[PDB]
Amino acid sequence: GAMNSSNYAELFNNDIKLFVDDTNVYRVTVHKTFEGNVATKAINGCIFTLNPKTGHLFLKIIHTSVWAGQKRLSQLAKWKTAEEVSALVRSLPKEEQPKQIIVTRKAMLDPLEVHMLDFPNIAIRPTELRLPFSAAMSIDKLSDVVMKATEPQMVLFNIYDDWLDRISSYTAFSRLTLLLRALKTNEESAKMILLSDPTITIKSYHLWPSFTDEQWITIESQMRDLILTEYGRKYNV
Amino acid sequence: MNTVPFTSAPIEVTIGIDQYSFNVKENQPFHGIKDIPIGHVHVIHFQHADNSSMRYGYWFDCRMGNFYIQYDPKDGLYKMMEERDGAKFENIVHNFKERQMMVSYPKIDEDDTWYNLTEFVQMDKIRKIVRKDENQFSYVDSSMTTVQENELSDPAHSLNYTVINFKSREAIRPGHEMEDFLDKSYYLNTVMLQGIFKNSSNYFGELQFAFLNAMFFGNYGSSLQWHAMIELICSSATVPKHMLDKLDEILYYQIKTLPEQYSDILLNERVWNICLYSSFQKNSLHNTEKIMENKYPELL
Ligand SMILES: COc1ccccc1CNC(N)=O
């Protein structure tokens, strides 16, 4: 059933799984019209599909053309997401297809189950974790590729850069979730933390800076401070 | 008017005949039910005084044979049987009638309840859901499971209801996943009506038979089937007008006949609220919505 704190280490075993997040699939700006009514204008979106063991990210860019002429876009978005995840799974060799797909929001369960009826052996699972994958558009290179896209497009990333060379998946995913949770609570401070030192660069083929081990411990500490902080600044504690 | 005689009543039992029930005491001089209307199916059903566990009974049509009840002290139940010697049967029934040892079906001359509960139910279809071809009548009880239930363990004692499953390939066309899941008209009209049931009467007959098994025996899989068949119609944007009108009449008498105190286990809050207030047909069940709201407003 549901993924939670008690079966957390199942994420890093050797059964292929994917997290799917649909938060950024359907994105709008809300604006006033000349007559003073409100309207939305969609901007490009993306499905965030991630293998937490390998770091492989299957970034499916949702171009605003997919909404043209459609009604009830928030509902459609859930099904568009399920159509695309299903196409991804079918595109992969059998030995690469996941055994489980964990959705980060329960409203994706039925859409994805129906689109995957051909795959009875793939478990479609919810989670009780509050994962910060919505913040994925706070990663500059990801936001950049989404916003520049002129057509539907799948882009492939490793969200862990080369971290797995030195740390385990469990640690790599803890770091990722901490960075993202920081970027979600205060994007400006988070990004400040990450770039303040101009000597630490981001390789052309990477998403995050090339920190040494010692520097990651400082960075991680600064991100936890920021998260505890904003929590005070929020609740006044 | 037809008759189901009883050889005897050796054990204290509550006997049910359609929506009617009576008390028979242990070794009371009881030999049957007379004046049963011809032209309808019927159900004779039983709850023992000593073990209210297992309600059980028989679906039958008097036009298909002379049927009687005889307690079996080995299997410990009242068994229906067919008498093939017609002369012997008429003679037996006449003697019992002369000795006034048969209770009377109290059919009132303004009452259309049984007709309206069994309008599309046929014995031929009952016998295909309840598979026991050597008898012209069909045994059902509280505990029997449905084919679908057995999928999710004896197949000979199953209720072979039509499997309905909204998250199945049968129900969802490739490429119309969202369309078909949110508007089940394809599954209702093409798969089920045109493909499996052939017409709406057969669909309504199974629905009505599922409700009655739910109500008389508390058969849980029957209740599941009854609610699934309602939901598949309510969740279809495109349903023939006559089906909607008949459905409303059908559900009206089911809700009317349900015991007030059993509504909590026989009625599925989610399906009913969805059907009456969210679904495409939320506005097409006037009679059913009015009685539901006046009689079971708590469930809603
Ligand atoms: C055949 O129905 C009967 C038989 C014997 C006594 C009473 C009745 C009628 N029951 C009822 N619930 O109306």
From Swiss-Prot, chain A:
Recorded consequence of changing D22A: Reduced growth at 30 degrees Celsius. Strongly reduced growth at 16 degrees Celsius. Strongly reduced growth at 35 degrees Celsius
UniProt remark on domains: The MPN (JAB/Mov34) domain has structural similarity with deubiquitinating enzymes, but lacks the residues that would bind the catalytic metal ion.
Subunit structure: Component of the U4/U6-U5 tri-snRNP complex composed of the U4, U6 and U5 snRNAs and at least PRP3, PRP4, PRP6, PRP8, PRP18, PRP31, PRP38, SNU13, SNU23, SNU66, SNU114, SPP381, SMB1, SMD1, SMD2, SMD3, SMX2, SMX3, LSM2, LSM3, LSM4, LSM5, LSM6, LSM7, LSM8, BRR2 and DIB1.
Outcome of swapping T104A: Reduced growth at 30 degrees Celsius. Strongly reduced growth at 16 degrees Celsius
Extra remark: Present with 468 molecules/cell in log phase SD medium.
Full protein stretch here: 1836 to 2069 of 2413
Effect noted on mutating R105K: Severely impaired growth. Reduced growth at 30 degrees Celsius. Strongly reduced growth at 16 degrees Celsius
Region (RNase H homology domain): 7-237
Function comment: Functions as a scaffold that mediates the ordered assembly of spliceosomal proteins and snRNAs. Required for association of BRR2 with the spliceosomal U5 snRNP, and the subsequent assembly of the U4/U6-U5 tri-snRNP complex. Functions as a scaffold that positions spliceosomal U2, U5 and U6 snRNAs at splice sites on pre-mRNA substrates, so that splicing can occur. Interacts with both the 5' and the 3' splice site, as well as the branch region. Has a role in branch site-3' splice site selection. Associates with the branch site-3' splice 3'-exon region. Also has a role in cell cycle.
Protein's recorded name: Pre-mRNA-splicing factor 8
Coiled coil ranges: none
Location relative to the cell: Nucleus
Outcome recorded upon mutating D22N: Reduced growth at 30 degrees Celsius. Strongly reduced growth at 16 degrees Celsius
Curated annotation (Swiss-Prot), chain B:
Gene Ontology cellular component terms for the protein in this record: cytoplasm; U5 snRNP
Modification after translation: Phosphorylated on serine and tyrosine residues.
Chain segments carrying region Leucine-zipper: 244-265
Major localization class: cytoplasm
Subcellular location(s) per record: Cytoplasm; Nucleus
CDD domains assigned: Aar2_C, Aar2_N
One of the protein's GO biological processes: spliceosomal tri-snRNP complex assembly
Purpose: Component of the U5 snRNP complex that is required for spliceosome assembly and for pre-mRNA splicing. Involved in splicing pre-mRNA of the A1 cistron and other genes that are important for cell growth.
Family: Belongs to the AAR2 family.
Protein name: A1 cistron-splicing factor AAR2
Source organism (scientific name): Saccharomyces cerevisiae (strain ATCC 204508 / S288c)
Lineage start: Eukaryota, Fungi, Dikarya, Ascomycota, Saccharomycotina
